[PDB]
Design a protein around this motif. Sequence first.
Motif, PDB file in Angstrom:
ATOM      1  N   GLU A   1     -27.951 -39.654  78.421  1.00  0.00           N
ATOM      2  CA  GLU A   1     -27.167 -38.488  78.788  1.00  0.00           C
ATOM      3  C   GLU A   1     -25.735 -38.546  78.234  1.00  0.00           C
ATOM      4  O   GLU A   1     -24.935 -37.651  78.496  1.00  0.00           O
ATOM      5  CB  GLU A   1     -27.142 -38.324  80.306  1.00  0.00           C
ATOM      6  CG  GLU A   1     -28.422 -37.739  80.874  1.00  0.00           C
ATOM      7  CD  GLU A   1     -28.372 -37.570  82.381  1.00  0.00           C
ATOM      8  OE1 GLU A   1     -27.441 -36.906  82.883  1.00  0.00           O
ATOM      9  OE2 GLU A   1     -29.269 -38.106  83.066  1.00  0.00           O
ATOM     10  N   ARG A   2     -25.403 -39.579  77.468  1.00  0.00           N
ATOM     11  CA  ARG A   2     -24.064 -39.611  76.887  1.00  0.00           C
ATOM     12  C   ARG A   2     -24.041 -40.047  75.427  1.00  0.00           C
ATOM     13  O   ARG A   2     -23.103 -40.694  74.967  1.00  0.00           O
ATOM     14  CB  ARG A   2     -23.135 -40.506  77.712  1.00  0.00           C
ATOM     15  CG  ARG A   2     -23.701 -41.841  78.132  1.00  0.00           C
ATOM     16  CD  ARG A   2     -22.530 -42.759  78.498  1.00  0.00           C
ATOM     17  NE  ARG A   2     -22.957 -43.947  79.215  1.00  0.00           N
ATOM     18  CZ  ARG A   2     -22.303 -45.109  79.232  1.00  0.00           C
ATOM     19  NH1 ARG A   2     -21.191 -45.291  78.527  1.00  0.00           N
ATOM     20  NH2 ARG A   2     -22.787 -46.106  79.956  1.00  0.00           N
ATOM     21  N   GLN A   3     -25.069 -39.663  74.682  1.00  0.00           N
ATOM     22  CA  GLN A   3     -25.065 -39.873  73.241  1.00  0.00           C
ATOM     23  C   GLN A   3     -24.518 -38.649  72.528  1.00  0.00           C
ATOM     24  O   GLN A   3     -24.834 -37.523  72.905  1.00  0.00           O
ATOM     25  CB  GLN A   3     -26.480 -40.182  72.733  1.00  0.00           C
ATOM     26  CG  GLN A   3     -26.973 -41.532  73.237  1.00  0.00           C
ATOM     27  CD  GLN A   3     -28.477 -41.622  73.290  1.00  0.00           C
ATOM     28  OE1 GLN A   3     -29.175 -40.608  73.384  1.00  0.00           O
ATOM     29  NE2 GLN A   3     -28.991 -42.842  73.220  1.00  0.00           N
ATOM     30  N   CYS A   4     -23.696 -38.890  71.510  1.00  0.00           N
ATOM     31  CA  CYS A   4     -23.216 -37.835  70.629  1.00  0.00           C
ATOM     32  C   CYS A   4     -24.407 -37.110  70.005  1.00  0.00           C
ATOM     33  O   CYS A   4     -25.275 -37.740  69.400  1.00  0.00           O
ATOM     34  CB  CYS A   4     -22.316 -38.427  69.547  1.00  0.00           C
ATOM     35  SG  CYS A   4     -21.715 -37.261  68.219  1.00  0.00           S
ATOM     36  N   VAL A   5     -24.451 -35.793  70.167  1.00  0.00           N
ATOM     37  CA  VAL A   5     -25.553 -34.977  69.640  1.00  0.00           C
ATOM     38  C   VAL A   5     -25.776 -35.232  68.150  1.00  0.00           C
ATOM     39  O   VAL A   5     -26.918 -35.261  67.668  1.00  0.00           O
ATOM     40  CB  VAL A   5     -25.288 -33.462  69.886  1.00  0.00           C
ATOM     41  CG1 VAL A   5     -26.115 -32.593  68.957  1.00  0.00           C
ATOM     42  CG2 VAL A   5     -25.577 -33.110  71.338  1.00  0.00           C
ATOM     43  N   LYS A   6     -24.680 -35.442  67.435  1.00  0.00           N
ATOM     44  CA  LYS A   6     -24.709 -35.657  65.990  1.00  0.00           C
ATOM     45  C   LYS A   6     -25.079 -37.087  65.573  1.00  0.00           C
ATOM     46  O   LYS A   6     -26.061 -37.292  64.868  1.00  0.00           O
ATOM     47  CB  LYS A   6     -23.347 -35.313  65.387  1.00  0.00           C
ATOM     48  CG  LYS A   6     -23.255 -35.493  63.879  1.00  0.00           C
ATOM     49  CD  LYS A   6     -24.226 -34.550  63.185  1.00  0.00           C
ATOM     50  CE  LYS A   6     -23.980 -34.471  61.692  1.00  0.00           C
ATOM     51  NZ  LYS A   6     -24.974 -33.567  61.035  1.00  0.00           N
ATOM     52  N   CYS A   7     -24.275 -38.070  65.979  1.00  0.00           N
ATOM     53  CA  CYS A   7     -24.435 -39.429  65.443  1.00  0.00           C
ATOM     54  C   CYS A   7     -25.096 -40.397  66.417  1.00  0.00           C
ATOM     55  O   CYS A   7     -25.309 -41.568  66.075  1.00  0.00           O
ATOM     56  CB  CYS A   7     -23.090 -40.003  65.007  1.00  0.00           C
ATOM     57  SG  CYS A   7     -21.980 -40.471  66.399  1.00  0.00           S
ATOM     58  N   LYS A   8     -25.413 -39.903  67.614  1.00  0.00           N
ATOM     59  CA  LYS A   8     -26.132 -40.662  68.654  1.00  0.00           C
ATOM     60  C   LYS A   8     -25.349 -41.848  69.262  1.00  0.00           C
ATOM     61  O   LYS A   8     -25.920 -42.635  70.029  1.00  0.00           O
ATOM     62  CB  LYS A   8     -27.474 -41.177  68.106  1.00  0.00           C
ATOM     63  CG  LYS A   8     -28.291 -40.116  67.352  1.00  0.00           C
ATOM     64  CD  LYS A   8     -28.605 -38.917  68.229  1.00  0.00           C
ATOM     65  CE  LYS A   8     -29.152 -37.739  67.406  1.00  0.00           C
ATOM     66  NZ  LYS A   8     -29.539 -36.595  68.288  1.00  0.00           N
ATOM     67  N   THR A   9     -24.068 -41.984  68.940  1.00  0.00           N
ATOM     68  CA  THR A   9     -23.283 -43.096  69.518  1.00  0.00           C
ATOM     69  C   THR A   9     -23.210 -42.920  71.038  1.00  0.00           C
ATOM     70  O   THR A   9     -23.232 -41.807  71.543  1.00  0.00           O
ATOM     71  CB  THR A   9     -21.858 -43.190  68.883  1.00  0.00           C
ATOM     72  OG1 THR A   9     -21.300 -44.506  69.075  1.00  0.00           O
ATOM     73  CG2 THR A   9     -20.907 -42.125  69.460  1.00  0.00           C
ATOM     74  N   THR A  10     -23.186 -44.030  71.771  1.00  0.00           N
ATOM     75  CA  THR A  10     -23.021 -43.972  73.203  1.00  0.00           C
ATOM     76  C   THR A  10     -21.543 -43.746  73.530  1.00  0.00           C
ATOM     77  O   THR A  10     -20.693 -44.580  73.190  1.00  0.00           O
ATOM     78  CB  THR A  10     -23.512 -45.265  73.867  1.00  0.00           C
ATOM     79  OG1 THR A  10     -24.898 -45.444  73.546  1.00  0.00           O
ATOM     80  CG2 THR A  10     -23.344 -45.188  75.385  1.00  0.00           C
ATOM     81  N   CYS A  11     -21.241 -42.609  74.157  1.00  0.00           N
ATOM     82  CA  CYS A  11     -19.847 -42.288  74.453  1.00  0.00           C
ATOM     83  C   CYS A  11     -19.338 -43.110  75.645  1.00  0.00           C
ATOM     84  O   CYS A  11     -20.102 -43.441  76.565  1.00  0.00           O
ATOM     85  CB  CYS A  11     -19.682 -40.802  74.734  1.00  0.00           C
ATOM     86  SG  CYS A  11     -20.041 -39.842  73.216  1.00  0.00           S
ATOM     87  N   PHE A  12     -18.064 -43.469  75.590  1.00  0.00           N
ATOM     88  CA  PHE A  12     -17.428 -44.083  76.747  1.00  0.00           C
ATOM     89  C   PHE A  12     -15.941 -43.758  76.826  1.00  0.00           C
ATOM     90  O   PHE A  12     -15.476 -43.312  77.867  1.00  0.00           O
ATOM     91  CB  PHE A  12     -17.601 -45.601  76.770  1.00  0.00           C
ATOM     92  CG  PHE A  12     -16.862 -46.244  77.918  1.00  0.00           C
ATOM     93  CD1 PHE A  12     -17.341 -46.109  79.219  1.00  0.00           C
ATOM     94  CD2 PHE A  12     -15.659 -46.904  77.704  1.00  0.00           C
ATOM     95  CE1 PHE A  12     -16.647 -46.647  80.297  1.00  0.00           C
ATOM     96  CE2 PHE A  12     -14.960 -47.456  78.769  1.00  0.00           C
ATOM     97  CZ  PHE A  12     -15.458 -47.324  80.071  1.00  0.00           C
ATOM     98  N   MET A  13     -15.188 -44.019  75.759  1.00  0.00           N
ATOM     99  CA  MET A  13     -13.747 -43.736  75.802  1.00  0.00           C
ATOM    100  C   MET A  13     -13.499 -42.248  75.991  1.00  0.00           C
ATOM    101  O   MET A  13     -12.640 -41.843  76.789  1.00  0.00           O
ATOM    102  CB  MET A  13     -13.048 -44.245  74.535  1.00  0.00           C
ATOM    103  CG  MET A  13     -12.887 -45.763  74.524  1.00  0.00           C
ATOM    104  SD  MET A  13     -11.742 -46.396  75.808  1.00  0.00           S
ATOM    105  CE  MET A  13     -10.276 -46.012  74.946  1.00  0.00           C
ATOM    106  N   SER A  14     -14.259 -41.424  75.274  1.00  0.00           N
ATOM    107  CA  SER A  14     -14.076 -39.973  75.360  1.00  0.00           C
ATOM    108  C   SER A  14     -15.181 -39.221  74.650  1.00  0.00           C
ATOM    109  O   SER A  14     -15.928 -39.799  73.861  1.00  0.00           O
ATOM    110  CB  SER A  14     -12.731 -39.545  74.764  1.00  0.00           C
ATOM    111  OG  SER A  14     -12.592 -40.041  73.447  1.00  0.00           O
TER     112      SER A  14
END
Length: 455
Positions: A391-404
Motif C-alpha cells: 500500500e505504499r509503493q510508488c505507482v511508477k518505480c515501485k519503491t517503498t515510500c517512507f520519508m515522503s
Amino acid sequence: SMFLPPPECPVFEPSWEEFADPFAFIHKIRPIAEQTGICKVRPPPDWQPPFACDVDKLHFTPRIQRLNELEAQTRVKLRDYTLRTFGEMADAFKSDYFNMPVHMVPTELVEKEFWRLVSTIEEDVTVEYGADIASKEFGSGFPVRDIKLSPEEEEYLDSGWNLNNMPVMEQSVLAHITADICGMKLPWLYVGMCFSSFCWHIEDHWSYSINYLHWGEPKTWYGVPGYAAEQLENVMKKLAPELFVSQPDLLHQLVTIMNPNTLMTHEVPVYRTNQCAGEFVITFPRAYHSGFNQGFNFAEAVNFCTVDWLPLGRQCVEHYRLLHRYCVFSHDEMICKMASKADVLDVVVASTVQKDMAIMIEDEKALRETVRKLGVIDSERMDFELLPDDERQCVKCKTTCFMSAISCSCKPGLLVCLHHVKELCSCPPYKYKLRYRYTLDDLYPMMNALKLRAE
Ligand SMILES: O=C(O)C[C@@H]1C(=O)Nc2ccc(F)cc21
Ligand SMILES: [Cl-]
Ligand SMILES: [Mn+2]
Ligand SMILES: [Zn+2]
Ligand SMILES: [Zn+2]
C-alpha cells in the motif's frame, strides 16, 4: 578445453581469537575477499557444532529443477520426502548416473559433467532439492532454544557463527528492522543432491550472505566481485535477454545457469571453490554467485548487513528505483528506526548510521524543494510504517515510500515517490498533497542523537 576451472577464491583459516567475532573477522578479510566476491572460511579445528537429526521425522516439499544453460528459472518463494527418502533418491541418482559408488566420484568430474549436461540440449536431466526457512517440520541445523539441550548444544546456542543469531546481533544493521521480512532475516535451509543448482544471483538489497554446509558432499561455487556486477549483467543480457523482461513481482524474478568460462571469455573475473562439510562461504555486497551440489548434502544460509554495507544499501535502492524493482524493506525506514534507538546503538553503528542519515536528509531536502516548485503546496504528516508495503509503493518505480510521497484525492490510496510526482494522475499539482513522515526539524535532532552516541 571444454571446461577450464576458474581460479580458486580466497580461503581463510582464522585462529579461535580471530574467529570469535565474525563481524570483526569479516571486516578484516574484506579488502581481500571483496576483490573476489566470495571467500571460504574454515573454522578452528575444535569449532564443531553438533549435527543431530532424525532423518525419518524431518520432511519437506521438494522443488523440481531442469538443468539447461541460459534457460529461465524462477527465484524460490517461501509432494513430500523425508530426509531419509530424499537421501536414498539422491544417492541412487548419483550412483546410477555415474555407475560408481555414490561417493567415489571425483569433484573435478562432477563439475566437468555438470557444464556438459547443461549445455547439451539433447540431455534432459531434472533433479530435486529443498529450499525453505526453518519450520516445525524441518528446523535449523544449528541449536535453537526450546526439549532439553546437551551441553555441547548449549555451547553453540549463542555463537556468532550460529546463523540463527547473525540477524539479531548488534553489528547487524538488519536487526533493528521492525518490519516483517522473514525471507531475508531468517536462514534458508537447503537439502541438495548431485547437480541441484543455484542460478546466478545477488542478494536482496545487495546484502552479504553467509552459507554453512552442515554435512554431506561438497557444494561447488562460482563467484564474481561486486565491482564487476554490471559487466556480468551486460553479458547476461546479451546472451539471455528474456531474463531481463521487466518482472511483474518479487515472486517472478528470473535467473539462469551460465558457464563461468563464458563470463571469463567476456573479461568478467570469476572465482571458484568447493565448500566441504563444516565450512562457510561468505558472499560480499553485489557479488554474483552460482553453483551446484556434488551430491546429497544440507546447507543453511542467511543474509546480513554490516555498517560497511550501509552506503551500498542506499545505492541499491536507488538502483531498484531505476529498474522499477520492488524493495524488501525501506532503507530510510531502517535508518530512522535506528536513529530513534540511538541511545542503545553500538557506537560504531551509530557513527555510520549518522553519515547515511546526513545524506538522506540532504537528498530529502532537495526533493521537497523540487516538488514545492512543481506546485505541490498542501502537506500532511503520514505514518508510512503503518501501511502494508504493497500500500505504499510508488505507482511508477515501485519503491517503498517512507520519508515522503505524493497523493491526490483523485486517485485514492495511490502514491508516487518524489522522483515521480508527474506520474500519479492528470490533476494539477495544487490538488496534490505531500505526505511526509518527518519535518526537516524532526530529523536534525534524530541525527544529533546519533552523533552524541557516536561521541
Ligand atoms: O547461499 C547461496 O546462495 C547458495 C544456496 C544454496 O546453497 N542453495 C540455493 C538455492 C537457491 C538460492 F537462491 C540460494 C542457494
Ligand atoms: Cl540439460
Ligand atoms: Mn545467495
Ligand atoms: Zn517513484
Ligand atoms: Zn488526481
